[PDB]
Design a protein around this ligand. Sequence first.
Ligand SMILES: O[B-](O)(O)O
Ligand SMILES: O[B-](O)(O)O
Lengths: 374, 377
Amino acid sequence: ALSKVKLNDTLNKDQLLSSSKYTIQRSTGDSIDTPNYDVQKHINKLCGMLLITEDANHKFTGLIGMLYAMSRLGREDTIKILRDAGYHVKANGVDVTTHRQDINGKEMKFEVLTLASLTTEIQINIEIESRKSYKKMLKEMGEVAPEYRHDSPDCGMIILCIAALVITKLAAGDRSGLTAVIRRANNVLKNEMKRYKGLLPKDIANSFYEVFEKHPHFIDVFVHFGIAQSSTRGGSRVEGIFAGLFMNAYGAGQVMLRWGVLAKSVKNIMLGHASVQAEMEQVVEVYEYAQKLGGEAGFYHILNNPKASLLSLTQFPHFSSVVLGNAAGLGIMGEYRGTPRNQDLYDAAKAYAEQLKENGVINYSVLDLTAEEL
Amino acid sequence: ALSKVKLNDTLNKDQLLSSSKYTIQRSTGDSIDTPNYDVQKHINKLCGMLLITEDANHKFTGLIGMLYAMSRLGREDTIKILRDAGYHVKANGVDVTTHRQDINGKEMKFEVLTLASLTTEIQINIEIESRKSYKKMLKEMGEVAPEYRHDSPDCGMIILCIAALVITKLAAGDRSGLTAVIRRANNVLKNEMKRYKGLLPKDIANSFYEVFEKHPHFIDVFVHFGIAQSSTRGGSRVEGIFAGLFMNAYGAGQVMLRWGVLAKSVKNIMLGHASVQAEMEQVVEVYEYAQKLGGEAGFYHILNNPKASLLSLTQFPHFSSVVLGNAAGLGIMGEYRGTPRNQDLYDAAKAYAEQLKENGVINYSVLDLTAEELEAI
RNA sequence: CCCCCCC
RNA sequence: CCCCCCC
RNA sequence: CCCCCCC
Ligand SMILES: O[B-](O)(O)O
Ligand SMILES: O[B-](O)(O)O
């Protein structure tokens, strides 16, 4: 039978990768700081110091943010996530030590962390500049409220909130999302920006973009932290904001998959086209593959998962075009940098979708109506 | 087939979070007082002291209320709830000690608790001001009845009754509910307010609002206490009031879910609309998800559970609008701060719902009627 | 190669 | 982001 | 909040 002449390449390719007899292990570099729960409070204070600092130097915030996420996971778990990801790790133990240095003649004491990635000389400067901003703040308002200070438990998570926004736009893979990252960091997180002078979306977002670009293993660390954080029973409102923003990243780099379901849901006529119907057998394969993977597939593009390519609908020019057309006709795309391979099908689908948002007839068969006198 | 082109994002997102291989542990701060059952009676007396005090300082009532809830749970269980929630806890043992201090020259004895959160100096002042209010009360009525005194077992739970009302309106997350909290604390809990001069709904409600804002882990403690309390076989009438008020919180921050079932139940015509029908596949996913979670989902918004966002119907502009319309047409909303994304669908649904409350024909097929002679009646 | 919107 | 009523 | 009769 001609029905038997088929080959499920999408499923078979996944099968090949899922059933590997051998494994690779990547060298991360020299050393990774793995802070445990004991150091967590200190990192939160360090995060707060950057947040209180007016016109702060967010060169290290991306890395500091990562340290806080790791301190929440705790040494044991963070090492486990690094090893499970496929990395050879030389773990550096983070401990609190008192450093004595004479700044402006007067000998001063500082509580610093034993970090390889962060110098003790740069750590003291974060505290130095924060104290300047704190005394200026104390001079302006007399007494500083718990909301405006570096001590606040929200501090670490506030920084990680923009990290969740960076992760949201990593699918583009070129820092193009930065504008949207800043925009959203202003709409959401508005109250947080009021309390902290150092909450500079652009500055912090670039720092995280840099850390994820320079250290791709940290993106795996963050994604797994975010999931672990989102597994919690409850928490603060800032922790709720983070969880929401982190979940906005789920399904990034696979918008066509969701827009495809939309086109079906709105019943765009162009889906029934002969050239679109030819692709159907194979488009179902990818949808069934996406269904099979479940939650796992959500962060496939964020973390550069090799199997992310398998979820592409771009390989089907006709279906992608009607899907993209429907999205344009419903006015839901833009400035989406996706181009339709078949222009005629796109234009036809865009036209029908534009006509759909003008009509709308009531389907009385859906409702459980008895004696109708309507 | 085009029927196969689907993706259950709601279910998959939950699956991802439910199957986490790794865990986070949060630092609560420095120390949390974990009082055991032995200290429970003392806290109830302290609660009673604030309740007998005319124009009492309810600055610490939110925290004292939490201590009573923890003393009912008992050290072991409270530590367990804190650890299960995802918090690193340095437990402080609460013990009763006698403190001698000379107030107005005369050396006085006081029974105080070894609390980190509450100073022994502030504890004595609660007792000092209560004694003043007690002697004034003794001068007014001669003999003080068991209902009017601080000794009463209801005291601790009376304070926790307004804590249940605060928890009821935490979904708004901005203290906006305070007006309703006070209002309800007057309708319900009316007899309790008669017996206690210090039962100031506004003052106590703000204290609990503050404690839940400053210490988010305490909201987890309270919710779990409330469930544990509501698991009881029986109790006092005040304990019954609490249980009822605590259960009013179940499903807060998810009113649209319940109003959606209402729209279906009343058979609002606008549900059959083309743009509403397109969303249907996905709206069922969330309803089935809510059905799957069961009782767990009830306090998802109260405790800032990460998965609470997944229960939102706001992501479906058309369905939400008809649901909100039906709620307005039936006159059940207001002043609900929810805005319909599709105005035309809302107005159409509001109109139909208004027409529904005017009609009403009897459906005789529902009843198990045999030989019908009602048409003659 | 894949990706690219909004929230 | 989510939420927001009444009881 | 719930409840509220009779036997
Ligand atoms: O543990 B180290 O090497 O002191 O940082
Ligand atoms: O147990 B403590 O430390 O005495 O309160």
